Every structure is written in C-alpha cells, then in structure tokens.
Amino acid sequence: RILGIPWGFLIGAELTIVQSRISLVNKIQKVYRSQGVQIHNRHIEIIVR
C-alpha cells in the first residue's frame, strides 16, 4: 500500500525473498557449523535459490 501497483509487489516480494535467503542460509549453516561440518555456501545457496 505504500508503493504503487508496478512496485508494491515488485520490491515487496523481493524484500521477502532477499530476507528469507539470508535467513535460510544462516539457519542451515547454524546446524552444520555447530556440529563441526564445513560446507561451502555455494552448495547451500543453490538449494535456497
């Protein structure tokens, strides 16, 4: 409602997507780093993508 029709959903969905991307990778890496498992972010970002 703050932004218009062509950008209320454009960047609004992007904010949800971008925030979820960094959140999802952190939570997944949190499990593996805690257990002493080293996995590059590439293998996780592909799944999150």
Binding site: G4, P6, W7, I11
Partner: peptide, 27 residues
Amino acid sequence: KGPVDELICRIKLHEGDTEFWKRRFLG
C-alpha cells in the same frame, strides 16, 4: 455498485508515475 463538498477531486491517483513512487521509496 450503485444503481456535498465533493472532496474526492483532491484524491490523486499516481498509477504509472514512476517519479512519484521513487520519492516515496526514498522517503
């Protein structure tokens, strides 16, 4: 769905006005 100061005249729609939405995005 219908079968006075008429203040509706000042309700300005900015559909398609890219410059207007950029200002609100900035602040």
